[PDB]
Amino acid sequence: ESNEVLFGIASHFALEGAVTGIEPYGDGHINTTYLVTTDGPRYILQQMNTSIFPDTVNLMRNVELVTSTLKAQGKETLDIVPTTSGATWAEIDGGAWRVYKFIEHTVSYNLVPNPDVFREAGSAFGDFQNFLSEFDASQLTETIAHFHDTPHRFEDFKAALAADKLGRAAACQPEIDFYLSHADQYAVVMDGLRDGSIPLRVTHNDTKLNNILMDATTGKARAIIDLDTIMPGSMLFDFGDSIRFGASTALEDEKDLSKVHFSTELFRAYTEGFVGELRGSITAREAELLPFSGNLLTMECGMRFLADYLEGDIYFATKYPEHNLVRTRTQIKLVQEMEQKASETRAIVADIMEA
């Protein structure tokens, strides 16, 4: 939006410096995010996507509960900057806006540069699972229904495919047929949750690497950010999604497929950190499904990218027409390698589970 509008938005919030600039920031696909520069402190300003999160009140109640609980344990988290009237967010001209303090002295990654970073990521999310277990499910109402219900996502995909709104299906038969042919695999976690063989836990639900901030000196995790999808789920949702994004040797939207590989060394690093925090709570069935949770969350994200492509890119932010097709192709390549390397990942998990 225009600067005049954005500076106007900023005036609603209890900022502690004169605003010098407001610039688009980051590579989130969901909310619209800006960096607020002032004559002193920095801020993150976000317009919340109400298409995706229609219940702003409940979303912000969840974020408030999580952050306040963290604060009350002396743990660094997202710091909501209230409106000048003391609200946690503002509705301004049909849009929903919030502000967080900018988290200083941090670095973040779209791509793992070495195993130590990814091990730290694993430790961070594993520990966060322990933290979240202090809530009961009723405290955190789901902000999006069926969020990691892969069979439900597959129904959405099949509908998008059948409608073929833009006639884009013709150019992506191999990708479409990949998702269709994997239909027998999608229900494994949901079935286990439904019959009680997989514990229902409170989870983060979007554990991609760029949602953690590492300290610029120590390299230790400083804060987990993007708290919008904290709700009941399976541990496997958080594990699988982390492996999806972070065990790849390439960016999520890497055009050159020959650069895209699933790294078992990176898998090992994350799992060491993750399981290292959760050894006392992880069940036999959860441990058994750790490798496949990689496949599943990658296929889920991929079919979502492709469905969006087939629907004309209504859900995810895109930079060019084919962007979601480029995204779905990396996810497919990753799953193909995860399948091929299955015995190796199983062995890695078993080795970590005993030690």
Ligand SMILES: CC(=O)N[C@@H]1[C@@H](O)[C@@H](O)[C@@H](CO)O[C@@H]1O
């Ligand atoms: C809320 C929401 O849809 N979040 C999605 C997440 O589920 C996954 O699709 C990710 C891929 O980079 O993009 C977003 O963060």
